[PDB]
Amino acid sequence: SDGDTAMKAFNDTFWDPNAKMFWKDSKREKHQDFWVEAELWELVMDAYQHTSDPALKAELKTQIDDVYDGTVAKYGQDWTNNPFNDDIMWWAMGSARAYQITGNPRYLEAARDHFDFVYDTQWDEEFANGGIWWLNSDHNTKNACINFPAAQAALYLYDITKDEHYLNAATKIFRWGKTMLTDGNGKVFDRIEIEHGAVPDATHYNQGTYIGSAVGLYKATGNAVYLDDAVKAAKFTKNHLVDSNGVLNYEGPNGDLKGGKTILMRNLAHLQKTLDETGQYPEFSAEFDEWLAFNIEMAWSHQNSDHIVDGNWAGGTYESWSSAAAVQALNGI
User: Fold this and answer.
1) At 225, which CATH number?
2) What is the C-alpha separation between 322 and 315, in angstroms, rounded?
3) Which DSSP state fits 81?
């Protein structure tokens, strides 16, 4: 299985079993940034769900717990001292998923308590008619990178609890985000800043969380508009966040964006699964499948002898966030 080989290689290159955290790069001098560590945590979970190897599956299941332990040892269990609401929500979402896989109540408490802190205290109706603030320290911007992940976290919590509160939250957050943080035709804007307005800079990871939240909402509500929303945002990504050959951009030099294809691929897998299961949008589904396969083959044709693929899919020290995207691409669920 290429997704098994890719995950094992990733772990062999970047996992630190002593600190129970991923290294930031192959120099192994600094561990991964907090928010990105949640995204690598979800990569472990995706590999767990994808693999048919029982021995690897059990190792990855243990690793789910170890990633949490290593982070809690350094950052504590209560993340509400972190001024970034996005950081908190990435961890709440990962925790909800970890609960689904393990049944360990620590994860349900972490997901619920952190979600509630952000949604109950950081949602505001006065600026821009809604939306969650990026930071809890200063209220100056409302961003795709907290709002769409929050809708996603709410959808996972709805699936766990079946409490309407969470479905209602997801619906409200997404309606606001679609209205204020997109163009209505699948372009997702980075943020809306007070005293400025929208900043219409699109990126892979924001296309991703928009698509995942839309697919999740389609599944929870049965409203076809949400699938349409997801398709439009996928089309935009394929046509406009790519180079002249159709290969996904290398976003960069900003370190947070470099690995964003990870999040994009995670969520494109959701859309692909839903199109395949429903038989909706069959023309687009065929175009989308061909383009995905093309991208993933380009990427893997550039693997090094250790089975690591740098984030520059179109072409020394390797970085775990940049290199995660190719691994995610082979472990989609």
Assistant:
1) 1.50.10.20
2) 13
3) G
Q: Which spans in the chain are helix H?
A: 2-14, 34-50, 54-75, 85-102, 105-122, 144-161, 164-180, 204-221, 224-240, 255-258, 261-278, 282-300, 320-329
Resolution in A: 1.5
> Could you tell me which of 85, 145, 166 has the C-alpha nearest to residue 121?
85
Which residue segment(s) compose the domain that 18 sits in?
1-333
Question: Over the range 161-200, which residues count as b (16 or more CB within 10 Å of their CB) and which as e?
Answer: eeeeebbebbbbbbebbbebbbeeebbbbbbbbeeeeeee
Question: Residue 278 and residue 302: Cα distance in Å, rounded?
Answer: 34
SS3 (DSSP) at 242: strand
Backbone angles phi, psi at 78, to 5 degrees: -105, 105
CB 177 within 8 A of CB 151: yes
Cβ(247)–Cβ(297) under 8 Å?
no
d(CA 228, CA 101): 30
Give the SS3 label for residue 192: strand
Q: Report which secondary-structure segment, H or E, holds 22.
A: strand 21-22
Q: How many domains does the chain have?
A: 1
Tell me the two tokens of residue 130: 């809604």
Cα dist from 129 to 33, 139, 172, 214, 242, whole Å: 32, 14, 11, 20, 33
Select from 208, 221, 185 the least CA-distant residue to 271: 208
